[PDB]
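Interim report, section 4.2 (structural modelling).
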Amino acid sequence: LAKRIIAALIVKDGRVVKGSNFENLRDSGDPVELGKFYSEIGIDELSFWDITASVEKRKTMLELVEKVAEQIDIPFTVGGGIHDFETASELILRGADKVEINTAAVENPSLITQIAQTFGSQAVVVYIAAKRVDGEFMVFTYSGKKNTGILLRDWVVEVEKRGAGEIVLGSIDRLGTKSGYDTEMIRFVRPLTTLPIIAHGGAGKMEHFLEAFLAGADAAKANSVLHFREIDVRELKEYLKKHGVNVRLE
Ligand SMILES: N#Cc1cc([N+](=O)[O-])ccc1O
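Predicted structure of the assembly:
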């Protein structure tokens, strides 16, 4: 099917961490207004990652999803510290289409199945953070702090078996570098799963997205290259379409 461009917003206390360069916005740090604007210029989905302190986090994330769902019509995912079914459930019911889990899934893979049994596989996005270690792709948890010793290859297969709907494949080797998506890692994972693969980490220019889709990604997730306007969403989709990639032009 079509390839998808997904804008990722890191949020804290209801604000976009580090804001954006869209001077047309009344508040370029408002994640609702920014998300709405992205939906109007051709982003396919949104992804919110919350890093609010724990005393206010639960209510803060629920307020976010409720305000977002009112304003946008495209799918969105919420994540950041979702550790159990009840937390995932309250966020979906309040408006999110999908939840994104990582550390809690690795520690308890049945969490994937629990959420999927009530909300469907299509509501469960597993973020897999992976890095090369001694020549093998290994899975990392706790914001990259912990080498689990689980092979990427084995965790991909288990994630699909447990009922996840999509995988975000984040390359710790590329996060924050603007040097390109980790196409070798994407090509490594592609034959191991039938699920949609969302590339994350390393985006710096339009050609990087073409490369990631040639590697077999179904979607590409990007952050500051969009918010700081190093890449324009409408230029990006026109570029991808020109070179043969099936993207939706609204
Ligand atoms: N979506 C997302 C996302 C997830 C993680 N993460 O699961 O560490 C980090 C940054 C992100 O933008």
